[PDB]
């Protein structure tokens, strides 16, 4: 069906620039009218602007005069959103929609930072410090210092997924993620089934994998 | 600029209850208001525009009107797709402004979290660093609030937070609680507790370890 199909994700240092598309995918002139929208994490949604290519016009918020640039290719019906001198404050996903708001696209994620790919450090949220057993017991695995997100967490190859909470990545202060991924368990199975995390990073290329057991420590 | 004032920004709802969202705009903008509707996924859609004209293929149960400057969006009979974020866009003049958004929750009984805590690991430590962790499972209301002690000494500054989303299946809500210290500080304390205050306790729970590390 007619629909709106963006650029993938983006990882630029600050003070470069980015250049974001959204594509018309079966539609015409008429149809390159697009709005772009941007989405900090946990945030409102804030217009950036609008491109009306029939009347070569393009409107801006104030606050993104001097930040964003819109243009338009009218024969492959795609519209470009040009950022520059991008800081921290422009990591969010943007958003193109068309005239009247009909259709929305998927959203692009931006992450700006000086950090580089880094794989993670995976440890064990070992059950007990000393306590034997005790009705429902609770392990993880504490997924630490990796970079960019995402990073993808099961347990037992995919057989596990029963009181399974995988949180919401962190950013830390050393400018690195981190996460824990923990499941409840019977007490009973501590001693006999085999709990193991797998953790794959796919911009790292690193796939880890650990075992939990009850060191009782 | 025209501003477009949202309230209320957080709801709490049962399913086949009957909700008003509201959007009150600084200056005219003659009925020209949309509503969109935002996913967990992040999927938008477009409900209304025009502040009362439905969207080809919207459910009925959606209605929208006017009332001097507040626009609202009613939703007759709530049910499980609706709990979602909701925005109002104005489209009166140049630039475009949007609502801050109103997130709709599914409101259940009061449920106490079961809390664990995690000492750092020996492999952690020969990194020089030491992470604590405190979960908090399977709670309701989201309000909770976690107080590490070292040594029966309260701690701030040295902790980081993150909570899931509201759970499909019971309407729960998780929390973990990171406290991160240097291997140096780490060694030259005993008693490390993690403290929770919740709606559905009568007293603080605390949970503590003194010397792990495996
Ligand atoms: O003159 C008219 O009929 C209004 C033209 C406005 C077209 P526009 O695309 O810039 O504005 C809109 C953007 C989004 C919506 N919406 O309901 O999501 C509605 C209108």
């Known amino acids: 069906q007619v629909q709106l199909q963006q650029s993938g994700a983006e990882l630029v240092k600050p003070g470069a620039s980015v250049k974001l598309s959204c594509t018309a995918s079966?539609?015409?002139?008429?149809?390159?009218?697009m709005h772009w929208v941007k989405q900090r994490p946990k945030q409102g949604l804030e217009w950036i602007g609008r491109?009306?290519?029939?009347?070569?016009?393009?409107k801006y918020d104030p606050k993104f005069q001097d930040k964003a640039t819109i243009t338009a290719d009218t024969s492959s019906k795609t519209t470009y959103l040009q950022l520059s001198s991008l800081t921290s404050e422009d990591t969010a996903v943007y958003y193109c929609?068309?005239?009247?708001?009909?259709?929305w696209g998927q959203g692009t994620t931006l992450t700006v930072s000086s950090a580089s790919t880094k794989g993670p450090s995976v440890f064990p949220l070992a059950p007990s410090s000393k306590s034997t057993s005790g009705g429902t017991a609770a392990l993880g695995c504490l997924v630490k210092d990796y970079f960019p997100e995402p990073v993808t967490v099961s347990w037992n190859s995919g057989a596990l997924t029963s009181g399974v909470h995988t949180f919401p990545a962190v950013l830390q202060s050393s400018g690195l993620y981190s996460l824990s991924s923990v499941v409840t368990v019977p007490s009973s199975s501590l001693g006999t089934q085999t709990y193991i995390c797998n953790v794959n990073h796919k911009p790292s290329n690193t796939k880890v994998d650990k075992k939990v057991e009850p060191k009782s420590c | 600029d025209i501003q477009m004032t949202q309230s209320p920004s957080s709801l709490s709802a049962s399913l086949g209850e009957r909700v008003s969202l509201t959007c009150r705009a600084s200056?005219?903008?003659?009925?020209?208001l949309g509503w969109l509707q935002q996913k967990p996924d992040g999927t938008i859609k477009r409900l209304i525009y025009?502040?009362?004209t439905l969207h080809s293929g919207v459910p009925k149960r959606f209605s929208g009107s006017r009332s001097g400057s507040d626009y609202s969006l009613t939703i007759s009979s709530l049910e499980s797709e609706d709990f979602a974020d909701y925005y109002c866009?104005?489209?009166?003049?140049?630039?475009?402004?949007f609502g801050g958004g109103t997130k709709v929750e599914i409101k259940r009984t009061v449920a106490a979290p079961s809390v664990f805590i995690f000492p750092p690991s020996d492999e952690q430590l020969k990194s020089g660093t030491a992470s604590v962790v405190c979960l908090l499972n399977n709670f309701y209301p989201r309000e909770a609030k976690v107080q590490w002690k070292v040594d029966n000494a309260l701690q701030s500054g040295n902790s980081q937070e993150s909570v899931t989303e509201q759970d499909s299946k019971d309407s729960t809500y998780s929390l973990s609680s990171t406290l991160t210290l240097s291997k140096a500080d780490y060694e030259k304390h005993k008693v490390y507790a993690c403290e929770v205050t919740h709606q559905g306790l009568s007293s603080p729970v605390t949970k503590s370890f003194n010397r792990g590390e495996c």
């Open positions: 200056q005219e903008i003659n009925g020209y």
């Open positions: 025009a502040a009362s």
């Open positions: 866009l104005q489209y009166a003049s140049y630039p475009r402004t």
């Open positions: 491109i009306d290519p029939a009347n070569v016009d393009t």
């Open positions: 929609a068309s005239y009247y708001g009909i259709y």
């Open positions: 079966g539609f015409n002139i008429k149809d390159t009218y």
